[PDB]
Design a protein around this ligand. Structure first.
Ligand code: NA
Length: 408
């Protein structure tokens, strides 16, 4: 199906199948995700996630056509069945209440849509289709495959994936595809930063940082057969001057997050926007959007504490005592946000904090002493690591930690 089989296609195929067995189990765990209880108005603006969710919800109700639509599918042909129906419906009818009819299976229509959204959100990752790939080891750091074109229907598929994610959000259902924060940034129209490069391509991040005694470069980029690309008009001709670089770094970073995925992302965003206008997400930051789409979980504090590792610090060290106390003080939603800051996602694997994964593989939540008291804490999400300055007080740590976290 589409791409010929590489050695690495075979590898990714098996991971996906295993994922399907695992997913079959995993639903019980997925069903205890939650957001907020219904309300229509959300009351007076208060900067909180709660208010934003309600306001959004409200927009979805208010603009909903009445009655329902039947989406008819077979369990073994979920992707293909869903695609046809959805694509042949007219986006506004997807705003009506969803009745998902699983063929041959007979009360809990909410329960069925929930499972359908979950299943389908894994089925789209199928290495056949060639839509996505992973940057790190195993299934670390999802991204659109630059070579999605190998599948000649790929843009239509991306458009459908767009409607599907808009429907999850529009009907308040959770998906589990694994999109990254920079991908959400793009749905919000925020420009991903250099910091964000570290999340997805840490070594590329290092090179950009290093970028005066340094070799020959051109406002051009080589992307892979091969084809080089302009990076602004007639860039081949335009020498990057080892002291004239911002244009290069900026455009580079921007290009790293748009290399060979421009039409695919456009197509994804038109699909989303037909169903639920992107304008409606205006209040959300990229972590809040992830939350809307994936759902909150209860963060088990003790699981967190147990499976944390330290560097130049023990559990006894004063700064870490202060850390855990502050975390305890936090409500669940602030615990999630700290989780997103340090690991780049609000999703926790099946068993909990021992299984945590980084770029390199198994990689538990880490805290090292590294800062400058005047510096705020910082993270390296590829390594699930918090750099926590050896602060000189509880209130020093608490202010800074809270600040870095709600920062955007
Ligand atoms: Na991570």
């Amino acid at each position: 199906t589409w791409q010929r089989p590489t050695a690495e296609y075979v590898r990714n195929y098996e991971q996906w199948q295993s994922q399907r067995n695992q997913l079959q189990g995993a639903m019980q765990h997925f069903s205890q995700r939650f957001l907020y209880q219904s309300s229509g108005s959300p009351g007076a603006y208060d900067r909180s996630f709660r208010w934003k969710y309600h306001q959004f919800r409200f927009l979805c109700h208010s603009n909903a056509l009445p009655s329902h639509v039947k989406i008819s599918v077979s369990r073994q042909t979920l992707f293909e069945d869903s695609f046809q129906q959805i694509m042949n419906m007219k986006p506004y009818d997807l705003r009506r209440r969803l009745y998902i009819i699983m063929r041959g299976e007979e009360l809990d229509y909410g329960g069925i849509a929930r499972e359908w959204f979950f299943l389908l959100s894994h089925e789209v990752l199928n290495p056949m289709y060639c839509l996505f790939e992973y940057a790190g080891k195993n299934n670390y750091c999802l991204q659109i495959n630059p070579a999605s074109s190998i599948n000649p229907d790929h843009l239509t598929y991306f458009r459908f994936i767009g409607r599907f994610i808009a429907m999850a959000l529009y009907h308040g259902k959770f998906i589990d595809t694994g999109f990254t924060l920079p991908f959400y940034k793009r749905m919000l129209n925020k420009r991903p930063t250099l910091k964000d490069l570290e999340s997805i391509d840490p070594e590329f991040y290092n090179s950009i940082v290093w970028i005066e005694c340094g070799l020959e470069l051109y406002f051009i980029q080589d992307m892979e057969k091969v084809t080089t690309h302009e990076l602004k008009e007639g860039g081949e001709s335009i020498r990057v001057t080892e002291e004239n670089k911002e244009e290069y770094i900026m455009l580079l970073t921007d290009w790293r997050f748009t290399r060979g995925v421009e039409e695919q992302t456009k197509a994804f965003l038109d699909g989303f926007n037909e169903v639920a206008p992107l304008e409606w997400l205006r209040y959300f930051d990229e972590k809040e959007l992830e939350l809307m789409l994936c759902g909150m979980q209860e963060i088990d504090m003790s699981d967190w504490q147990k499976s944390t590792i330290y560097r130049h610090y023990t559990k006894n060290s004063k700064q870490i005592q202060w850390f855990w106390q502050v975390v305890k003080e936090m409500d669940n939603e602030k615990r999630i946000r700290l989780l997103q800051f340090v690991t780049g996602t609000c999703r926790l694997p099946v068993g909990g904090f021992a299984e945590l994964i980084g770029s390199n593989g198994p990689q538990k939540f880490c805290i090292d002493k590294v800062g400058k008291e005047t510096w705020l804490p910082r993270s390296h999400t590829c390594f699930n690591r918090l750099d926590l300055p050896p602060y000189k007080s509880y209130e020093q740590l608490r202010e800074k930690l809270l600040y870095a976290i709600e920062e955007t």
